[PDB]
Design an enzyme around this catalytic site. Structure first.
Site, mmCIF file in Angstrom:
data_model
loop_
_atom_site.group_PDB
_atom_site.id
_atom_site.type_symbol
_atom_site.label_atom_id
_atom_site.label_comp_id
_atom_site.label_asym_id
_atom_site.label_seq_id
_atom_site.Cartn_x
_atom_site.Cartn_y
_atom_site.Cartn_z
ATOM 1 N N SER A 10 -11.074 -35.589 -10.231
ATOM 2 C CA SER A 10 -10.847 -37.010 -10.457
ATOM 3 C C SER A 10 -11.860 -37.528 -11.476
ATOM 4 O O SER A 10 -12.977 -37.050 -11.536
ATOM 5 C CB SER A 10 -10.953 -37.793 -9.139
ATOM 6 O OG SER A 10 -10.997 -39.183 -9.389
ATOM 7 N N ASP A 68 1.333 -28.757 5.009
ATOM 8 C CA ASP A 68 -0.107 -28.762 4.760
ATOM 9 C C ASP A 68 -0.451 -28.116 3.416
ATOM 10 O O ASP A 68 -0.485 -26.883 3.305
ATOM 11 C CB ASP A 68 -0.825 -28.036 5.911
ATOM 12 C CG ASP A 68 -2.341 -28.006 5.748
ATOM 13 O OD1 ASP A 68 -2.879 -28.742 4.901
ATOM 14 O OD2 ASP A 68 -2.987 -27.241 6.497
#
Length: 330
Positions: free
Chosen positions: A199, A35
């Site tokens: 992004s 994770d």
């Protein structure tokens, strides 16, 4: 040193991925959920409330000659999806794919919430976010990656997740055969403890690319792709019959649909998520309504590049003094 381990979807929807991990002496092998959105390595154990174990493989510290109780230390964690676990702490030898750490904090669960109990295929979690998020008290502990870092050939690990298929986590090296073209690296903020990046925009299907900054985290422990409501609306508007359902808990679409692809930007580069990756199947057994793999982050408080996005790429988690993230097509 290096390590290399295969990671495998737990079910037909890729709801999560498990990776075998050796703990203790002699080895006890548990299948853990790697994770990158948390920083505790915790396991089902001999100490876990018996009613809360349903098929998991357990760690038994008393059978490990190298296990030592970390006196006084406890842990307690809650995740973004509402699940939780807590217990005490041992140190022991932990190996992933040939790579060994001695003295790793192994957090032993006394209690787990029902979603973990119901997941018989997941024996625990291995956190790969920054150690600042580790919940052990009163002495915070380091992640497996942080402990291994100095011994690694290169201070990196890579995530190469499969679509309905096995993939790979590598530690200490970049497999140049595992991706196509070049790797594009992008800046990371560690301020919230996550692999947080920005992004450069998105496109829907064969549509034009929209340049726009989307701050988010690379999180292998989250199934879906969670993005701003504007972006998600623009995606599902291209699917006939798609709608946001409060009763179901997100966007659903007719199972008869053909989903468009979704592109996200990494600097000047582009990662394309095929439409099939965004199908998570009937909302209930036998339904003709299907659950979407792209959902709104509104109300989460952060955008999450989960497995839906990451499995379309070869992803480098660069733990150099100044951390960065790399993405390549594959």
């Amino acid at each position: 040193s290096t390590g290399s381990a295969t990671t495998t979807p737990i079910d037909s929807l890729d709801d999560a991925y498990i990776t075998p991990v050796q703990i203790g002496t002699p080895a006890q092998t548990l299948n853990l959920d790697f994770d990158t959105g948390s920083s505790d390595l915790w396991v089902f154990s001999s100490e876990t409330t018996a009613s809360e174990v349903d098929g998991q493989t357990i760690y038994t510290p008393s059978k490990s000659t190298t296990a030592k109780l970390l006196s006084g230390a406890t842990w307690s964690i809650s995740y973004g999806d509402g699940s939780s676990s807590s217990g005490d702490v041992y140190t022991d030898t932990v190996s992933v794919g040939g790579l060994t750490v001695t003295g790793q904090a192994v957090e032993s669960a006394k209690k787990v919430s029902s979603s973990f109990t119901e997941d018989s295929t997941i024996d625990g979690l291995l956190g790969l976010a920054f150690s600042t998020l580790n919940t052990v008290s009163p002495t915070q502990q380091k992640t497996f990656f942080d402990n291994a870092k100095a011994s690694l050939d290169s201070p990196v690990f890579t995530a190469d997740l499969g679509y309905h298929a096995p993939g790979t986590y590598n530690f200490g090296f970049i497999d140049t055969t595992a991706y196509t073209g070049s790797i594009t690296y992008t800046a990371v903020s560690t301020k919230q403890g996550f692999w947080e990046w920005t992004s450069t925009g998105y496109a829907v299907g064969s549509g034009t690319f929209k340049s726009t900054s989307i701050d988010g985290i690379a999180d292998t422990g989250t199934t879906l792709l969670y993005l701003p409501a504007t972006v998600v609306s623009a995606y599902w508007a291209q699917v006939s019959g798609a709608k946001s359902s409060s009763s179901v808990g997100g966007y659903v679409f007719p199972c008869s649909a053909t989903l468009p692809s979704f592109t996200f930007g990494v600097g000047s580069a582009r990662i394309v998520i095929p439409g099939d990756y965004i199908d998570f199947g009937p909302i209930s057994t036998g339904s003709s309504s299907c659950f979407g793999g792209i959902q709104s982050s509104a109300g989460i408080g952060i955008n999450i590049f989960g497995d839906v996005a990451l499995k379309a790429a070869f992803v480098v988690f660069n733990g150099a003094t100044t951390p960065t993230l790399g993405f390549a097509s594959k």
